[PDB]
Design a protein around this ligand. Structure first.
Ligand SMILES: Cc1cc2nc3c(=O)[nH]c(=O)nc-3n(C[C@H](O)[C@H](O)[C@H](O)COP(=O)(O)OP(=O)(O)OC[C@H]3O[C@@H](n4cnc5c(N)ncnc54)[C@H](O)[C@@H]3O)c2cc1C
Ligand SMILES: NC(=O)c1ccc[n+]([C@@H]2O[C@H](COP(=O)([O-])OP(=O)(O)OC[C@H]3O[C@@H](n4cnc5c(N)ncnc54)[C@H](OP(=O)(O)O)[C@@H]3O)[C@@H](O)[C@H]2O)c1
Length: 426
């Protein structure tokens, strides 16, 4: 009755733990046949952002729940199978599954003038049920709808091949002996180009802009334990900026010597993509750097420098869009490309709705959602309160009108934060 949680992923298990530890009645409605979120989906053969060779890029001790450590025989980056098995055994140890409805998809959420929210869910039977709930916590995560190129390049209609997104990619063993263009330079592109390159006959990597490809580790320490190390923090910014530059050139030299465009923005201003494989796949010819895709000329794809290439498939690793389809009201947005959420969680106009996990930090999100979960628990039963509406909107306006200075206008810079001082406020 008290709290309807949408999402049994990492973020929704976390919030369910935090209400349970306060004694608030709640349910997690999850659409998937088990808990775990995206990490469950490779190994269930299901269309999700992950793939079979997906691993963590954050340190296990920094990524597992601070109350429930990951198995110690786990490596610093476990596989998607290892984490999704860790999440479920977490749900077991917290006794949350009795409060979990699996295979139940929230189809709409509406606020009633009395305060409670009516929430209609769809079961495996295709049947729908409508229920009222005192508060609602959104925990559905923002990598849920595939983001395509704004126009598909010309002739895509008659490509005589197979054009897909990172969500529909699974093993690559499905691409054994074929010819694939990977479109992207993000965490999903580098990973998938390298998965092909062991299965594909030829593996191309089309890129539009240069990104700062960085190894998972420097000095033995992963890039996430460095941003918690006292030394790193005790240095300024320009001390850190050239610190990494020297380390990256000593570790991988110049990206231009791999066929990759040089970033138009320096490390810390141009998204970093962490890989320990791609450059060494270029240097062995297993993946071949390309520019943008210009056309689909028959059974081949034509690139912007002029080259042709026979291609049986193209998997677009072009990102994802943040959609919240069950809120007819509109995702908490500003229309300049920005989120409307006091402290990245609370909508100012709607009492009783929280958003857990709609943040993008450097490194693991886990502690951020642990904090968001504990604060939303004391908001529900009144052991914490919020400013007035207008004061909430002043915090949100300082956060916007600020992400333009450390960052800039773009896409989704509005769910972005530092780890340290954000969690300092808890
Ligand atoms: C490919 C990929 C790799 C990543 N790798 C890392 C990594 O290595 N390290 C790291 O720290 N972070 C990583 N992340 C970030 C990642 O989002 C978090 O690790 C974690 O998955 C948090 O997910 P979440 O619980 O917020 O939501 P998600 O796990 O994204 O999904 C939440 C759940 O909500 C459910 N849901 C959605 N809509 C409904 C509905 N209407 N009704 C019912 N249920 C619904 C979904 O089925 C899902 O189970 C990665 C993300 C992606 C996409
Ligand atoms: N643990 C892991 O190893 C792992 C694996 C996968 C994902 N993740 C995480 O999960 C999220 C998934 O993001 P993602 O991997 O999809 O990467 P992303 O950050 O969304 O980047 C997608 C890539 O597509 C390019 N692109 C965007 N629009 C394009 C267009 N219209 N045409 C062509 N190319 C275009 C971008 O180029 P530009 O940058 O130049 O715009 C970028 O290189 C990220 O937060 C990532 O860190 C982690």
């Amino acid at each position: 009755m008290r709290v309807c949680v949408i999402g049994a992923g990492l973020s929704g298990l976390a919030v369910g733990h935090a209400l349970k530890e306060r004694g608030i009645s709640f349910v997690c409605l999850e659409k998937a046949p088990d808990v775990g979120g995206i990490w469950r989906q490779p190994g269930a053969g299901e269309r999700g952002p992950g793939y079979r060779t997906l691993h963590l890029n954050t340190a296990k001790q920094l990524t597992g729940y601070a109350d429930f450590p990951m198995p110690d025989a786990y490596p610093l980056y476990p596989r998607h199978s290892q984490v999704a098995a860790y999440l479920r055994s977490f749900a077991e140890w917290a006794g949350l599954l009795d409060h979990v409805e699996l295979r139940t998809e929230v189809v709409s959420v509406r606020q009633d003038a009395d305060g409670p929210w009516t929430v209609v869910s769809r079961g495996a039977d295709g049947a729908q049920v409508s229920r009222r709930f005192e508060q609602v916590v959104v925990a559905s995560g923002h990598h849920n709808e595939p983001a395509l190129p704004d126009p598909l390049p010309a002739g895509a209609d008659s490509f005589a091949g197979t054009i897909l997104h990172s969500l529909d990619y699974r093993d690559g063993g499905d691409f054994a002996g074929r010819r694939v263009v990977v479109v992207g330079l993000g965490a999903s592109a580098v990973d998938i180009a390298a998965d092909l390159s062991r299965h594909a006959e030829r593996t191309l990597l089309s890129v539009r802009r240069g990104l700062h490809i960085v190894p998972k580790q420097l000095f033995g320490m992963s890039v996430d334990e460095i941003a918690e190390a006292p030394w790193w923090n005790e240095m300024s910014f320009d001390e850190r900026r050239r610190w990494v530059e020297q380390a990256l050139l000593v570790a991988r030299g110049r990206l231009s010597d791999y066929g990759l465009p040089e970033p138009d923005h320096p490390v810390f201003s141009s998204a970093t993509t962490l890989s320990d494989e791609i450059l060494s796949r270029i240097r062995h010819g297993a993946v071949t750097p390309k520019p943008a895709i210009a056309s689909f000329d028959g059974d081949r794809v034509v690139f912007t420098d002029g080259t042709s290439e026979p291609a049986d498939a193209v998997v677009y690793c072009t990102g994802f869009h943040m959609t919240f389809p069950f809120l007819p009201a509109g995702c908490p947005m500003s229309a300049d490309g920005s989120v409307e959420l006091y402290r990245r969680v609370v909508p100012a106009d709607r009492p009783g709705l929280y958003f857990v996990g709609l943040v993008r930090p450097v490194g693991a999100i886990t502690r951020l959602v642990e904090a968001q979960a504990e604060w939303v628990a004391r908001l529900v039963d009144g052991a914490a309160v919020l400013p007035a509406a207008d004061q909430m909107r002043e915090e949100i306006g300082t956060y916007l009108t600020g992400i333009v200075q450390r960052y800039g206008r773009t896409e989704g810079a509005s769910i972005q934060v530092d780890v340290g001082p954000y969690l300092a406020e808890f």
